[PDB]
Amino acid sequence: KHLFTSESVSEGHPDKIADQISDAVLDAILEQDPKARVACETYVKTGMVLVGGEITTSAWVDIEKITRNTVREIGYVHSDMGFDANSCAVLSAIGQQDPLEQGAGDQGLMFGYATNETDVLMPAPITYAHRLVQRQAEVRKNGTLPWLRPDAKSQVTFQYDDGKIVGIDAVVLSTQHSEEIDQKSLQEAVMEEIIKPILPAEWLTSATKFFINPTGRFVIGGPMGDCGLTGRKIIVDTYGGMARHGGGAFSGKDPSKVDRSAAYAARYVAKNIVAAGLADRCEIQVSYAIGVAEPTSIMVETFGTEKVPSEQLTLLVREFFDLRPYGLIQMLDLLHPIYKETAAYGHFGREHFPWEKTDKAQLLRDAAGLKHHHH
Amino acid sequence: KHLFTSESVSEGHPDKIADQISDAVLDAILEQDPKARVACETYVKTGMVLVGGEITTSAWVDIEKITRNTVREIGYVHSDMGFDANSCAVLSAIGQQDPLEQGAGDQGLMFGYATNETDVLMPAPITYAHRLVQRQAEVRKNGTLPWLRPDAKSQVTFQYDDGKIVGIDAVVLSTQHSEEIDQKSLQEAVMEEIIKPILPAEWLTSATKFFINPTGRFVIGGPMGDCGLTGRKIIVDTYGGMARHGGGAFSGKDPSKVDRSAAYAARYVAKNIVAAGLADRCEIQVSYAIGVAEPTSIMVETFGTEKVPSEQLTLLVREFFDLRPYGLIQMLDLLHPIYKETAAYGHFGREHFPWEKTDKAQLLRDAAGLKHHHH
Amino acid sequence: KHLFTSESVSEGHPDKIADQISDAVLDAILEQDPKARVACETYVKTGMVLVGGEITTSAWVDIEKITRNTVREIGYVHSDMGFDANSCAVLSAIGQQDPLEQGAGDQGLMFGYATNETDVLMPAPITYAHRLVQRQAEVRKNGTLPWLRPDAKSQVTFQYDDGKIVGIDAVVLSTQHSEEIDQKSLQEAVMEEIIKPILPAEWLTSATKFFINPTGRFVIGGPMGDCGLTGRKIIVDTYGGMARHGGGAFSGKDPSKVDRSAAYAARYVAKNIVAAGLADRCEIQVSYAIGVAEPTSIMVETFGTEKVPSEQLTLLVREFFDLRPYGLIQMLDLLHPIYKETAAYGHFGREHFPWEKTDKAQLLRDAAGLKHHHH
Amino acid sequence: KHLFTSESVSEGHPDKIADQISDAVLDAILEQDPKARVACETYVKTGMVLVGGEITTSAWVDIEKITRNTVREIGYVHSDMGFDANSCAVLSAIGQQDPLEQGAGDQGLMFGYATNETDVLMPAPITYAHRLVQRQAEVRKNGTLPWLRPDAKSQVTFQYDDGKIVGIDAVVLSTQHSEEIDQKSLQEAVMEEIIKPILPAEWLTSATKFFINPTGRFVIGGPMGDCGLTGRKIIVDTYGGMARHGGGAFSGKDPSKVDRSAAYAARYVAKNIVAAGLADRCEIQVSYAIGVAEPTSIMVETFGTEKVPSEQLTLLVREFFDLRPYGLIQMLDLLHPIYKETAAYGHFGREHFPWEKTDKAQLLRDAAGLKHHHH
Ligand SMILES: Nc1ncnc2c1ncn2[C@@H]1O[C@H](COP(=O)(O)OP(=O)(O)NP(=O)(O)O)[C@@H](O)[C@H]1O
Ligand SMILES: Nc1ncnc2c1ncn2[C@@H]1O[C@H](COP(=O)(O)OP(=O)(O)NP(=O)(O)O)[C@@H](O)[C@H]1O
Ligand SMILES: Nc1ncnc2c1ncn2[C@@H]1O[C@H](COP(=O)(O)OP(=O)(O)NP(=O)(O)O)[C@@H](O)[C@H]1O
Ligand SMILES: Nc1ncnc2c1ncn2[C@@H]1O[C@H](COP(=O)(O)OP(=O)(O)NP(=O)(O)O)[C@@H](O)[C@H]1O
Ligand SMILES: [K+]
Ligand SMILES: [K+]
Ligand SMILES: [K+]
Ligand SMILES: [K+]
Ligand SMILES: [Mg+2]
Ligand SMILES: [Mg+2]
Ligand SMILES: [Mg+2]
Ligand SMILES: [Mg+2]
Ligand SMILES: [Mg+2]
Ligand SMILES: [Mg+2]
Ligand SMILES: [Mg+2]
Ligand SMILES: [Mg+2]
């Protein structure tokens, strides 16, 4: 019997604004130069975006237009909301100053995770936290609730009973909105259009507490309310705290940065082990030394749910997966402008991303000797 | 049998520069106004520091002098190193626009952890990673190795055998340095002055791999090499990945921000459970809803090492600890300028910090009914 | 027979926005510390104000609130106008690191001028250019023309016939406005409310050309349209080109800066010579060497209109006026927060400023031996 | 009998640093796109360059490399001098969002001047002020005085006797320098290498005062000492105060901006009148209305030195010169990357610039009927 909690934030949360600008700049560069080196760090606050860092590329991009386009899409288009794509400041401080045996670009450690408690092999709490804010954005943009504004957060507390979901104990939904909607109207609409359509009714009972805009009015937000920086939502981006984290941010980094590529690979590995039926849950840790191709370490954790000995799993992983930094890029077909889409609503659990394919599961299952004997 | 890896970075790593500026600004404010509200986000890169965010305070501080003093102390005092305290740009964009029942200032989730694998009740990998970079800084500043420069990283891979440390498998030490030292000289000096004095000789064997400045020369660094931002080393700041993380950054936040205060409290709770002998390792999760005083959730995880039933532990925690946001500040005496010291070499494991006191351990032990029966 | 032209700009022109922020910061400091050293340079463009330079002061000022207050007063309060006081970025980069024999703080040259072609002893073209934009601001702010927006420019071409004003040949008035007013409506209203009430009807004839918003619609302006910097309207600030200029900017400089104080003194000198009847027009040049109290040069130019020999005038000036840098501050009572008012609509010709007093005129006249002999 | 004073500043003065960055960016764009629209405003101070404004161009330029290259050429290459090309911050905030009948892009007024008191038809004071700082830069860069640093100023006071140069009354030379040179050594070297080789010995007498580094040591300078902005040396750029000024800055503006093109044209006109022998000195004023091709006014001032009636001169100017904004660009062949060279040591008096050609002088002389009758 334990209570576990995860959160997510909408595309209009200031940290998420920064992540999406960083990745919109990455995508624009990769469209022209797939092998670009990009380390693009964004900082947003009242009236301004600062886009900085380092790029090595043949590409020619307009950082200001990409930034303004990104903010406009998120929905900040007027001073009444606290922030305007068309009239904010955009400052740029980007410095433009056998292949599988290439060393890691940096040291570090990265984790990946999978669990069969959902069909996408993700933890339920982060899954439903993301779906809530993704729903908030959908009913804002489609005109179902046209008074919604871009900045929102969600938080879901699940109840477990020896590792089985019993229900949802608590739900937090805080949304920005225009001045005209009153709080009772806002709470009813958020319950009917956002919460009830996303959370399974089975998990919602008399024991469920709902905190909808628990401080009431939330008119001013996005960067006016809170400074936002790239890489400040790394637990929202991953597994909502259910799994460990190595500390590296994803957004604004090209696929040569093992902080992103090896975390994607570790998800792919974990997900294929669980899809194979070789465990019910699996956490992978990998680590690198700058200038060294072979990871300094690989760890496979199955929390006692493995269907074959743990040492045999570690072997299967070395056998089927090339975790050298350029083996990663090959393994996942990463040199394409696919990253802006990851930079809100989570890097995992959306099954069109290359690191969410379970195209190794039968291979691992066969290689492990799992198959039924008769008679 | 598993390999686990943690890293740390010196006070001269650009992300750590940002953390220390943010907390130097917090301390300067709390010295004058202990109840200040501070959310100070720093961004450093080639030639500049940007210090931004939001403060509510009666204090009057010189952000530029605090910044320059902080960078000078870290050791960046010349263009030859890539960055100069005295001549860099400092830009400021800080907007200055029953008490225990006060609501949390934000939603979120926070973890704390303790393990008796070290005397300070920390995981060994993060402990020894921090000690390595702390040693690098000490031999740089005391003139033992005067050619060292401020930017460094460490990484240590431990070998476990069913949860007992067998040894150290791999050690990474990457340090900045002046142009005059050659790499063989640098590797010998780092082995003799930094590595061998910090890592127990028992754990160092023929199986131990050493990667000292594995890309060779590292003359240019700090902000010139890599943009740095507040809150981009949250796993170095905590448990090196051994424990989970809720995603919140510590530095530049006053103690009313549950991202910092509740993580400190969760460490205090976990550490006192383990010091009490109520478990060998303990992870606490807590979460809040904005405007709500009582946490939305509390979870006590003991990984099967508890000495009393798990439900009884959850009770002991509600009984002995007030996890309401202002109960935290009272519980830990937090309204003092003590934070710059946390902003490099880890927020945990240094036992003079208030959240590292084990002043509840005997209390919890007595309350749990642990004591020996004779005859 | 010659045509001469001068321009002026409203308080909402971006260069004038910068001047007024610089001087609002100066005034706020002098209110607390009359002997402050201030060199405050402002830069405005789309979404941002940067306030920089150097101050030596005991004062404690909130640069962000002063900036936002200044922009709000000018009238930029919405993204629809291109700029919002409440939601723009404000960045600060101000470094806070016998008395009459004190040296000049810098070298330089400064001119002052007076002419009896107006009652305020100013050239008519700059006088009427300022009055036009000052009128534009008055009918905008008083609701006479509520659709006006803050950014405007004026330009007036006078016809002279051997140095006597014959009339006005050309009038330019370009004003920002809201989207709702059509251009014919705007032209009629500007002619009736701004032009006809300010320019003497005697000077307006069939030969007069009027260019009112000659490019038509002007909805977007202020910083969105044009970057603005302190000290980029030095000819609008002075004599509209009728007199020479030494190149120094006024705004954001305390009275120890001879670029401001000696130009004010040179106006005072010229104005008192002309008010004395010792010439009909008078241009003064003074210059300084850094660290030298006595000006390196003084020149008195009367364009052949002197009523006493030129050498005798130069003597009268050395006799009645102390042009040493601290003699200036004493001569004009300058250590008071009086400067924001100078930073739009001209530093000269408004007779409540201390350098516009003619309290030496009778003294100079008596000392020159001008007085009527009878019989 | 009158004393007149002019100043100049070296390429390392912070305002001049800004002018040269603005024009280096203009040149880089015009090299690729001769018809680019450019309005590039620079701001330099401790540790940073901000390059902003508005460009309409097909060109692709690296603002950061152009900036760093420009600062390096000027000579700021180390923190010991206060500023380093290689390690300063560069921030960019440039928004990239019958032909002779095209309207002026803005209103305004512009002056041009010529006088036969020098062979280049410039006033002597500005001529010799520029030559002094140009000499300071030459002996710094050629290693004659290798301890010189980039920031310097000059100021020269000439004595006139009814409009004829009698001599030089005062000379100011303030130069930055390294820590190693003492002030007596510096004064002797500046007198021998900079002053005596540039100023005619005839003009230097017992009455001449010399102020060499009159405040002594000047080690820290460039942007560390003083914020610099584009367009803050408009009187150094033109005629040193001898002639009037319309207020417009030159640097960072493409030739479609009448603030630059019409001032260049007005110099060309004045210079060709004086070279023709139609006056000994000539000041031209022109002015424009936004969206109007024909200037709102033209004024020809000859200070009583004309050799033909004044009305006939005004006619000659309308006849020989097309002052419509695109007539200017054609008249002077302006669509070429020639502007960085203007942005230090004066826009006039260097006779390879297109507006310094006297290719109309014989034409004007013939058209005026000036020629000798015999017998
Ligand atoms: N030549 C070099 N050799 C070795 N290490 C180097 C070298 N140059 C820089 N580094 C280090 O590499 C560091 C990068 O650390 P880190 O902040 O983790 O990078 P990041 O890519 O921004 N990721 P994170 O902030 O963790 O998401 C630099 O800041 C230096 O400490
Ligand atoms: N009136 C309000 N009511 C509720 N939520 C609000 C209100 N105002 C702002 N918020 C939200 O609170 C958010 C803060 O999120 P977060 O980024 O986690 O904060 P942080 O303190 O910088 N911590 P982190 O970046 O996680 O270390 C804002 O950006 C909004 O989404
Ligand atoms: N110690 C010093 N001795 C002499 N001159 C110095 C010293 N320190 C700096 N200076 C010079 O003084 C200059 C100031 O020039 P200037 O740009 O005219 O100043 P300003 O006050 O901004 N006025 P302006 O831009 O003309 O309105 C510096 O930039 C240096 O060239
Ligand atoms: N559509 C428009 N119609 C008319 N005037 C306009 C329009 N858009 C902007 N303007 C004005 O044109 C001004 C330009 O003034 P000014 O500051 O003299 O320009 P500049 O080119 O930077 N020159 P200076 O600072 O004088 O060297 C703008 O700031 C507005 O007042
Ligand atoms: K923040
Ligand atoms: K970075
Ligand atoms: K401009
Ligand atoms: K300045
Ligand atoms: Mg945040
Ligand atoms: Mg990292
Ligand atoms: Mg980093
Ligand atoms: Mg948070
Ligand atoms: Mg301007
Ligand atoms: Mg000056
Ligand atoms: Mg200046
Ligand atoms: Mg102009």
Numbering used by the authors:
A (entry chain A), B (entry chain A), C (entry chain A), D (entry chain A): 3 to 99, 111 to 388
Paper text:
MATs are an essential and ubiquitous enzyme family found in all domains of life. 38 MATs catalyze the condensation of ATP with methionine to generate S‐adenosylmethionine (SAM)—an essential molecule involved in numerous biological processes, including RNA, DNA, protein and small molecule methylation, polyamine synthesis, and production of enzyme cofactors. 39 Analysis of available crystal structures reveals that bacterial MATs are predominantly dihedral homotetramers (D2 symmetry group), that is, comprised of dimers of dimers 40. Two deep cavities harboring active sites are located directly in this dimeric interface, making the homodimer the obligatory functional unit.
Further, whereas the small interface of NgMAT has no salt‐bridges, the small interface of EcMAT contains eight: Lys98 in each EcMAT subunit forms a salt‐bridge network with Asp64 and Glu67 of the opposing subunit. 26 To explore this hypothesis, we generated two reciprocal mutants, swapping the salt‐bridge‐forming residues in the EcMAT small interface (Lys98 and Glu67) with those of NgMAT (Gln98 and Lys67), and vice versa. Additionally, we solved the crystal structure EcMATmut at 1.6 Å resolution and found that the protein assembles into a homotetramer that is highly structurally similar to EcMAT. PISA analysis of the small EcMATmut interface revealed that its hydrophobicity (ΔG i /area) increased by approximately 30% compared to that of EcMAT (11.8 vs. 9.0 cal/mol/Å2, respectively), whereas the net per‐residue electrostatic contribution (ΔΔG elec) of EcMATmut was comparable to that of NgMAT. Following purification of the E. coli mutant (EcMATmut) and the N. gonorrhoeae mutant proteins, we determined that the removal of the salt‐bridges did not affect the catalytic activity of EcMATmut, while the addition of salt‐bridge‐forming residues to NgMAT resulted in substantial aggregation. Removal of the salt‐bridges did not change the kinetic stability of the tetrameric complex. Strikingly, while at equilibrium the tetrameric fraction of EcMAT constituted 30%, the tetrameric fraction of EcMATmut was only 5%. Based on these measurements we calculated the tetramer‐dimer equilibrium dissociation constant, K d (see Section 4) and determined that the K d of EcMAT was approximately 11‐fold lower than that of EcMATmut (8.2 vs. 90.3 μM, respectively). Interestingly, removal of glycerol from the incubation buffer resulted in a dramatic and increasing aggregation of the dimeric fraction of EcMATmut, which, led to a loss of over 90% of the tetrameric fraction after 120 hr of incubation. We found that the rate of SAM accumulation by EcMATmut is approximately 60% lower than that of EcMAT.
